[PDB]
């Protein structure tokens, strides 16, 4: 409505964006409908670009070049995206309809690689996120316990992994039961203070082993 040379352009853009797949449910989770919608969207975009209704304008041409799925254009316009996870989700949205867990780690690794190549530096949190994307719960919680000293976060993560009914480790890479060690560490850190010692009682009652003698000594 503002620019006089963009009415039909925005109309064509809105008509093209209507073919976006918003997770169809034709009975169950089907990827065929998503793939067909993505193919139809790509075909409509290519047809518009070849006809000319989506050309002869620098702004919309750059928009289409970004939507097609490139890397150098996004590295130049990095002021819009956030970090490596934003780059990865942008690639997965503008390059493929959907991805599988067998290729998600590969795509995330390639995203982090080209993001670091395009003027960047390594980062411990970035490496932790890359490990989380590469899965292996044992090694990601090992990296978490190595880097971050927050015992409550590791305790919550172990509780979630136990609630999810997954195979967990019964040893703390030296003794046994990681949740008991985390609760004992939090109890020590809380007793280091001079106030609030009520949660330690229940956290020691939850441990039917060293918690009794620990509370009796504290």
């Amino acid at each position: 409505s503002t620019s006089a040379s963009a009415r039909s352009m925005c109309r064509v853009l809105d008509d093209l964006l209507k073919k976006m797949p918003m997770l169809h449910t034709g009975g169950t989770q089907t990827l065929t409908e998503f793939e067909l919608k993505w193919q139809h969207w790509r075909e409509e975009c290519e047809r518009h670009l070849q006809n000319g209704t989506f050309s002869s304008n620098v702004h919309m041409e750059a928009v289409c070049r970004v939507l097609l799925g490139d890397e150098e254009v996004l590295l130049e316009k990095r002021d819009l995206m956030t970090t490596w996870y934003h780059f990865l989700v942008s690639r997965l949205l503008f390059k493929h309809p959907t991805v599988k867990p067998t290729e998600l780690h590969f795509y995330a690794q390639s995203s982090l690689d080209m993001f670091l190549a395009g003027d960047s530096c390594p980062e411990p949190l970035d490496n932790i996120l890359l490990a989380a994307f590469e899965f292996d719960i044992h090694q990601v919680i090992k990296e978490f316990s190595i880097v971050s000293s927050n015992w409550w976060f590791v305790a919550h993560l172990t509780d979630l992994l136990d609630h999810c009914q997954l195979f967990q480790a019964h040893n703390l890479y030296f003794g046994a039961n990681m949740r008991e060690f985390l609760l004992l560490d939090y109890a020590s850190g809380l007793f280091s203070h001079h106030s609030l010692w009520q949660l330690g009682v229940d956290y020691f009652d939850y441990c039917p082993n060293l918690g009794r003698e620990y509370l009796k000594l504290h």
């Binding site: 590969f106 690794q109 690689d113 190549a117």
Partner: protein, 97 residues
């Protein structure tokens, strides 16, 4: 040997190669420490082993032919391994032909 200083830009499998090489490096350091301590242990215990007694390793005493049969079987298995390596080489050569 001089080609390991070129090849610009990583690939899709280069990061997996890097992480596997890091795992192999830490495993090699651990095994090197183990070998270093085992060498000292053996250098300290060799005199005691020579002063004491040496055990036997000749198995199957009731059958005097089973030992040579097992030895010939192991030699023929090694020959089969060599022949299979040669056959794989010939197969890839004929494929490249």
């Amino acid at each position: 040997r001089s080609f390991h200083t070129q090849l610009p830009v990583l690939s899709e499998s280069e990061r997996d190669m890097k992480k596997e090489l890091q795992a192999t490096n830490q495993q090699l350091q651990q095994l090197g420490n183990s070998i270093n301590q085992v060498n000292r242990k053996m250098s300290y215990q060799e005199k005691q082993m020579e002063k004491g007694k040496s055990p036997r390793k000749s198995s199957l005493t009731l059958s005097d032919y089973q030992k040579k049969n097992i030895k010939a079987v192991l030699k023929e298995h090694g020959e089969h391994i060599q022949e299979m390596v040669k056959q794989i080489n010939n197969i890839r050569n004929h494929v490249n032909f």
